[PDB]
Design a protein around this nucleic acid. Structure first.
Lengths: 203, 108
RNA sequence: CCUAGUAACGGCGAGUGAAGCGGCAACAGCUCAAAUUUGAAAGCUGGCUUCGGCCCGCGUUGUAAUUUGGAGAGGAUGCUUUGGGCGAGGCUCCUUCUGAGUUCCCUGGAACGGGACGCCACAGAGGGUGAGAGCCCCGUAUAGUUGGAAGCCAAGCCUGUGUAAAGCUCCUUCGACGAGUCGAGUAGUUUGGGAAUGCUGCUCAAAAUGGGAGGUAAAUUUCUUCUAAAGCUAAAUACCGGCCAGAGACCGAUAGCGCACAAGUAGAGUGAUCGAAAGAUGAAAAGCACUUUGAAAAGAGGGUUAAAUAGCACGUGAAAUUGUUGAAAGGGAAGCGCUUGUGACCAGACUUGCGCCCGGCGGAUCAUCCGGUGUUCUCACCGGUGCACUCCGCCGGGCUCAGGCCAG
RNA sequence: CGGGACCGAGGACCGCGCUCUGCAAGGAUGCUGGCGUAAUGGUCACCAGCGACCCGUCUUGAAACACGGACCAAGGAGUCAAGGUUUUGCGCGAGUGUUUGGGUGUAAAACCCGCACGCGUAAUGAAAGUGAACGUAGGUGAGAGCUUCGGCGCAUCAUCGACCGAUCCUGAUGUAUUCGGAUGGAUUUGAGUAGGAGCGUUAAGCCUUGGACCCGAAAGAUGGUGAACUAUGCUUGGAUAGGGU
RNA sequence: GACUAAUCGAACCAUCUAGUAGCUGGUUACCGCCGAAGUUUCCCUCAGGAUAGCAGUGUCGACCUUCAGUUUUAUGAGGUAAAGCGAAUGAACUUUAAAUAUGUAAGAAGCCCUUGUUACUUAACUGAACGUGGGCAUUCGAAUGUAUCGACACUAGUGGGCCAUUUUUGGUAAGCAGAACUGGCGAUGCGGGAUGAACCGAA
RNA sequence: CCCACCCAUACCCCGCCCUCAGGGUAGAAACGAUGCCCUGAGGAGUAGGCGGCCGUGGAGGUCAGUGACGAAGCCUAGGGCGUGAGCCCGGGUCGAACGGCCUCUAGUGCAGAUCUUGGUGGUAGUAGCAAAUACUUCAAUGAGAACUUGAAGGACCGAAGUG
RNA sequence: AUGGCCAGAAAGUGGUGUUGACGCAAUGUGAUUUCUGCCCAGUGCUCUGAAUGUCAAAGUGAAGAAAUUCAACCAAGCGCG
RNA sequence: ACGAGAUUCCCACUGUCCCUAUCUACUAUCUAGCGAAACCACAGCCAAGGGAACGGGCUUGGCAAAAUCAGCGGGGAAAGAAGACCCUGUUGAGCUUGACUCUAGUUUGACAUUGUGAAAAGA
RNA sequence: AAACUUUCAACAACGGAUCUCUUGGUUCUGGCAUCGAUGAAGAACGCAGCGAAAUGCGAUAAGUAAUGUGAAUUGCAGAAUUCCGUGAAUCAUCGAAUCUUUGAACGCACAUUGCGCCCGCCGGUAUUCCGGCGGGCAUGCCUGUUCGAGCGUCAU
């Protein structure tokens, strides 16, 4: 199964520039950090759960925080991208748990945020005072605000008295019954409708 | 290397259905047999459980966190109660867990 | 990167072949059309300016403000928000400047070679100089240090304050949203999407919780997702062109680009086009004064050079092939194998060693003992002791043994 | 009992023996002469006796035919990549693989890091789906090795069983009375289970695809350049004694 | 089918392009160890394929079991010569029995006996098969030979060629044409046939 | 029919080389154990297969390697080693670098290809230098005069010309 | 001549054509003299003469919840005559 | 009639022939000067034998004496002869035809471009 | 015996291999973004005391200005440089200039150094003639200005 029947030699890409490109990327990152100092080099990202049944076990970083997350955290949507927070207006919060986790994440960031005044001689009440402006900082939000628990714990200890009884009939039989009911949902509905029509006709 | 080749020595002498738009993530269900079930427990606490230093507590094993969706039933289990949380399970695997004294819980 | 040579497509099968998810590099968001400013076109090109403005116009068939679906408009409500000017200092680019032997001897035409004695080193990369130079010269390393220009970032500091604009919270209500377009049929082409792809042409041609999509055609009932037919936008990505630079287990003048040279030149072709060959005296021209023979080219003397056995035919100077000299063979081929002989020319081997017995010399690193030291812990070395029937060399003899070539 | 030829391997002793002070008994010593250098030996040229087709290619069974070769120098042809496969070496081992990327660096090196991912750890069926222990992981016959000498038995082979999936038949307790599919049989089947063997890398052979060992067609296609030759035409010019009828 | 710049049944130039060839030519040091092959069996043939057989490198297994292009023995084929018919009867007669090569068999992995079953078969529990148990090691049941084992893996050439003896089937005016075995050659030098693919000796 | 004699790479005995096979070799006085010692058998080879060695350009390590008191290259009727491919030395020439060992690496080994480029032979002082009628004398110039010039002669084109 | 014969990718394009049957175009034969064996009706040439016999797309009707299916009608040419 | 068209014959004419001879110029030749190429495995006397109907080299004989010059066309060499001819191809290309698949041109129908009035015949 | 042919050797030829060299190729990596009507790329023709080319330049022509450096250039000739300096140089840098005929190429043309038009200035006796010099004259399109055309729609 070799696909060499076209003029493949015109489109061969070698990668001798791999260490040079790593050096170029590191120089660009150092320049970006020096331009952004004392801000972190990256923006804060929310925690989202991967789609599909293969990957819904694991969480990861998403694009940006939702508008309802920002509203529940008390950060206006025009202020948020100016203080290192990514905003995503497309994502919605369908469930309470992800919303609560990302709201707590935003609150921890806001509690650890040091906001310098726009004019040094005229600080405002929303600004961090000068005698709190000096503290140890982080320059990597992907590290200091990473995904701490991407997966659930695979091991947990409980007492023998707290062992669950289990579903009646067994887990295998419960799976078989659930599959059977899903396959027979429409047949039973049609049969019930026909029985109701017959009962109405010959009541 | 060119000096080891035989050419140097030869110098001087010459069905079924079609499935459109198949998404493999639909059919993701890796399986693990019950004879590997205790290897998911970390080694130290596993050794205490197998020796008999934990007579009043039972391990709860989440297969999805380890990357498995179905518990299959090859092998035999020791007589230690284990709670197993799985998306799928075979009838023999559930039977052997129940004889061991645990329970198979269903999760999504 | 992986998905994945997978789903899928394919005469008579050769073959073809994505995407979602996932990890990563890089991340950045927005502008219109559809609304009456209507208590005031609040907008703008151009001309003239005394730089204050004033004109000619554009434009109501709509220029500003306001709004863009994440909303927004109207209300309610009480708090928040803002404008200028300096600026220490830092960074980027050209500029001045940077350590140490030409010490002594030998070979050599020339030390940059060999030997000796030093020195520098955040510099022992590279090159040049009459032969392999850290210290002769340029440079090389590191902090800096002179002088200049233009930008950027920036710790902070002076000031105006609310006419206006701006954000947050809640809400009865309102909430415009792109048409020969979407979509359908058909034709061509294209795709893995030859049941599920895109594009274009022709015909038909929409709608308002509407429309598109949900990879098997259709009707009915649901559900989920976005919101087309207007528009802008850095980065991560590409790079056999151009400019600057650094490198290589690459090639070393028939190689490496066609071209290391006045090479895309000379030359060919009407023309489009085609397209070479060709590097090296010597450290320094010191590139041969002068004499002589020739009409001259040149030759011979004599010179230069370390070398002309380097003479602008020029480093080295192979072979084919040629001339001279020397040797030899040859009655219609030579060349080759085995074996003598002749002639010519050669490499080895050998030249004496070891061991005794006497004699003569020259010295006490004889044996034992003592002390120290080291070792394999019982063996050694070093210092004293020998006083010459003992050790160690040398010189004369004599003897035994072993020695080269061919033979009986 | 004579006569002659060729040969002397080995290198303390050990052995078999005999004719036993010793020997001819598991391989040559003793005595003597000339010479000590081109004398022996060697190389080259030539003569002599005997021997001796010109190489390569091609063809078939082979020759012959045919093809290439005036001479010399330098150049000159099974390579590299991707993917398989078998075998060798190496690391780790139910795991294995740092190098997409990140960190770091004396800076294309070396060193370090981990999420995902690939392959392996489970198969089978078109699919929905289901999914590997009766038994010290079974019986029997062999079987290296070990043994307390009674046996225990590796790898592997042969043979009979057991377990999972597929196909066919039967259809239990139960029940959303139409679902569920136990139990028991019968065939083939799968590199299936039955006390894991793989992953990465190195080296070689072989296979597949690429110009694919090197040189060679008549060709096909895309885009350009020619009527200074020649063919035909148009416009405008030029030229052709003297006789006969 | 003339001419279109020495180019014409389709000009010249550059490119795709290192186009394709199964056809032709060529394909680069040495020594050592092994070493071949030509219908065997199947497929529609020629412009055909596979494949057996024959080889080499690695291993591995108890390199365990022994086997063998040979003779002998029993028994087939060849009863065919031969002897007799004072044996019977008359190559087709036989008491007996050829030469040549040739088939099958010749142990403990074997030989039987017994027990039952049978879904075989037989009139039939009768034979045979299937198993079961037992007896036989007192000599392991001819000769000669035996660095000759087996199984995998991977790799390669040749796989409807020539000549000859013998046997056999057909033929021609005479030549000869098919098969089968065996030997030689293609791959091979040496001694002799003056000379040489096919001869003799000997590798 | 008989007797003797001649010689093959065949047969016999002996030496030497290689291959294969079978043995020995540590309380190591012990060894390129990848070695050494003992014994036996065998030796042709195309296609084909396998092993070991030699040589070339370049890379790491190493030899305290060689070298202007002469590296590399080249020539050699001069030698030594190896079965061989090859390796080493002497002599001459020459002028600036190069080699051994273990690994690494490849654009790595030529007699052929009507091979490529360049150079050179025999042929061979050979074929030939024969269309267009044709040359001669003196003097000068010059090193040198058939094919330069002047003069003196002889011719040709022949007006659709050699104008 | 709203033509014939050509050309062009197309064109508000060009030629024949500054043309008009004593012309233009395409063929065959090849001066003059000689010269048309005899008769048709199979292929062919051409007839809008009747047919729907074959009968595309569009269009029409029926069934179905629709996709769809079934029916007639059906130009030229062919067929028939 | 005309013809560098193909054919048979007659007269004249003659070196076409019997049957050859002779003369001239330029060569060839010899000299001075100048100076190639083709081709070339190696070479060049034969006879008989050398199974494959072929020898130049082998076997067995005949033989066989330097170095040369002019000629010659037996043999070897020598033909852009790698020609021509025959045979083979997964052969190439030109050409033909009711060979296959297409197609320019032409022809026919429909939809659109496509508007304004009448008169009928059907819904 | 020589000559001739062939073999062997030395030296000399022929030829340019070998060895060593390399201001050149080749491949990789890093950085950068900058042509033109303000006339580019390309072409032609010229320019040095003595050059044909290569290189450099444009009638200001192997160059001018400016900045820097600080004593050359060199084949010949001829001059240097107040060296204690407005300064050598085939020097470097480069911000100011010059930049022939052309070319997208622009008055129309170009196989012609052909033919024009508009406006200025200067010279020759010159209100008329002759000559020279300078500045202009392409196309498509946009904004604007100005001059217009049409019963196209109107007002009066």
């Amino acid at each position: 199964n070799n696909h060499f029947r076209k003029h493949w030699q015109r489109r061969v890409r070698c990668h001798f520039d791999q260490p040079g490109k790593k050096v170029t990327r590191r120089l660009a990152r150092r320049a970006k950090a020096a331009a952004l100092a004392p801000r972190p080099v990256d923006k804060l990202r929310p925690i989202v759960r991967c789609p599909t049944v293969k990957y819904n076990r694991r969480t990861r970083l998403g694009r940006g925080f939702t508008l309802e997350e920002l509203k529940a955290a008390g950060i206006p949507r025009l202020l948020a991208p100016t203080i290192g927070i990514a905003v995503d207006h497309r994502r919605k919060n369908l469930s309470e748990e992800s919303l609560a986790a990302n709201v707590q994440r935003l609150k921890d960031y806001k509690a650890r945020l040091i906001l310098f005044p726009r004019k040094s001689n005229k600080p405002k009440k929303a600004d961090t005072p000068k005698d709190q402006q000096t503290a140890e900082t982080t320059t990597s939000l992907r590290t200091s605000f990473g995904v701490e628990q991407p997966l659930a714990p695979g091991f947990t200890e409980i007492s023998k008295s707290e062992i669950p009884a289990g579903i009646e009939g067994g887990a295998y039989r419960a799976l078989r019954k659930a599959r059977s009911d899903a396959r027979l949902v429409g047949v039973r509905e049609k049969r019930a409708k026909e029985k109701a029509e017959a009962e109405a006709n010959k009541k | 290397p060119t000096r080891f080749s035989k050419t140097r020595k030869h110098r001087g002498h010459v069905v079924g259905m079609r499935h459109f738009h198949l998404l493999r993530n639909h059919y993701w269900r890796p399986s693990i047999n019950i004879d590997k079930l205790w290897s998911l427990v970390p080694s130290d606490v596993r050794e205490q459980y197998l020796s008999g230093q934990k007579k009043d507590t039972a391990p709860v094993i989440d297969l999805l966190s380890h990357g498995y969706a179905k518990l299959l039933g090859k092998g035999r289990l020791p007589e230690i109660p284990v709670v197993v949380r799985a998306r799928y399970v075979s009838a023999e695997a559930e039977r052997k867990v129940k004889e061991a004294g645990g329970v198979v819980e269903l999760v999504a």
